[PDB]
Design a binder for this molecule. Structure first.
Ligand SMILES: O=[N+]([O-])c1cc([AsH2])ccc1O
Ligand SMILES: [Cl-]
Ligand SMILES: [Fe+3]
Length: 119
């Protein structure tokens, strides 16, 4: 039972939390200066808002697939490595108010993806 992760670099975090509460009909799961997240049931979605220091507009920070356990993260790592993708693995790695196992790739046009579990 995994979900898409969508992490956005937003110019106004406060306006953004406001807007996403309305769009999804639910408040954030977590709020800390310069960061918020929403854990959305339908559609399955982890929405990450990161506050950008003076960009004009919202832009993509990264994308992701949140899996159920580290076991799934490692399957995904081996499978992606086997398909010929350049990968970067991380274990028990702090970051944004959580600990995660993750594997990272980048699409041809430079957009970053992580397959990850939050521990
Ligand atoms: O790419 N990252 O490692 C990354 C990780 C976290 As946590 C937040 C923003 C980012 O761009
Ligand atoms: Cl963008
Ligand atoms: Fe993140």
């Amino acid at each position: 039972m995994s979900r898409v992760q969508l992490a956005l670099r937003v110019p106004d975090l406060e306006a953004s939390i406001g807007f996403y509460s309305k769009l999804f009909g639910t408040g954030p799961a977590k709020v800390r200066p310069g960061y918020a997240n929403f854990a959305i049931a339908e559609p399955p979605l982890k929405l990450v808002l990161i506050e950008g220091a003076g960009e004009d507009a919202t832009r993509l920070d990264h994308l992701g697939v949140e899996v159920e356990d580290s076991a799934q993260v490692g399957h995904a790592a081996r499978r992606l490595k086997e398909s010929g993708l350049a990968t970067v693995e991380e274990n028990d790695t702090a970051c944004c108010y959580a600990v995660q196992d993750a594997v990272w790739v980048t699409g041809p046009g430079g957009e970053p993806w992580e397959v990850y579990v939050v521990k």
